[PDB]
Amino acid sequence: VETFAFQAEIAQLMSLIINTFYSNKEIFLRELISNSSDALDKIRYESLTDPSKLDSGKELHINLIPNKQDRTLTIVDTGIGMTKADLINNLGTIAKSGTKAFMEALQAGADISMIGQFGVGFYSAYLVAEKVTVITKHNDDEQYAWESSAGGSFTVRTDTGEPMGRGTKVILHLKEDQTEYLEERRIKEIVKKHSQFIGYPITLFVE
Numbered sequence: 001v002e003t004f005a006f007q008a009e010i011a012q013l014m015s016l017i018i019n020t021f022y023s024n025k026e027i028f029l030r031e032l033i034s035n036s037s038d039a040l041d042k043i044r045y046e047s048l049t050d051p052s053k054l055d056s057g058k059e060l061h062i063n064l065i066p067n068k069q070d071r072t073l074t075i076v077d078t079g080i081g082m083t084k085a086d087l088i089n090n091l092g093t094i095a096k097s098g099t100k101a102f103m104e105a106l107q108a109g110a111d112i113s114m115i116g117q118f119g120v121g122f123y124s125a126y127l128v129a130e131k132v133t134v135i136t137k138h139n140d141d142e143q144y145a146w147e148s149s150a151g152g153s154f155t156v157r158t159d160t161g162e163p164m165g166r167g168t169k170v171i172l173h174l175k176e177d178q179t180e181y182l183e184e185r186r187i188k189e190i191v192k193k194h195s196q197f198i199g200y201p202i203t204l205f206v207e
């Protein structure tokens with residue numbers, strides 16, 4: 001297991017998300033579904049010139065899986081997946097500029113719900129989760145597990161859990177007071193409100 005420090009700017013963003021009073025927490029789900037849709041768009045596009053990129057799975061979809069026993073909400077997609085370089089360095093480099101812009105917008109009067117317009121919507125996960133685990137598999141790279149409970153660091157390891165084929169699984173370990181996001185009615189409501197027109201099937205599993 002390798003442990004890394006977040007860039008200072010991203011640590012600051014996570015602290016702001018964790019510490020700011022903001023009731024409209026449900027937007028985290030829209031942001032994660034958006035990221036899934038983006039990843040699905042990318043593998044679909046690449047498959048047009050290299051059909052073999054779908055050898056790891058032709059179905060392009062999103063599953064939402066609540067588990068009350070484990071207090072987790074899991075979002076699974078069969079998108080392009082992230083590489084080790086994506087997880088450790090490259091997405092963070094991109095996130096730095098987006099974070100700076102988002103921070104400045106907030107001081108200017110924007111609200112946390114606009115986070116996705118700056119490309120850093122993933123971090124809204126910390127509105128509802130005490131720990132986030134991201135399991136991901138890109139073609140021709142290994143399956144990795146990224147994890148962070150904030151506090152300025154994250155870890156990356158090669159995942160020896162069940163093989164995914166291709167795509168990303170975001171496991172939200174929910175805060176004790178955020179279990180409403182395990183309820184079927186609540187998840188359905190949020191998907192209908194914010195993710196109505198996503199161009200891939202979204203299947204809400206039931207417990």
Ligand SMILES: COc1ccc(-c2c(-c3cc(Cl)c(O)cc3O)noc2NC(=O)C2CC2)cc1
Binds near residue numbers: 039119167
């Ligand atoms: C908004 O920024 C990004 C959005 C998605 C990704 C991504 C993902 C991905 C990332 C997150 Cl956090 C997620 O909840 C779901 C995802 O499927 N898997 O491959 C990617 N690789 C990509 O290149 C995606 C096309 C952009 C990476 C960055």
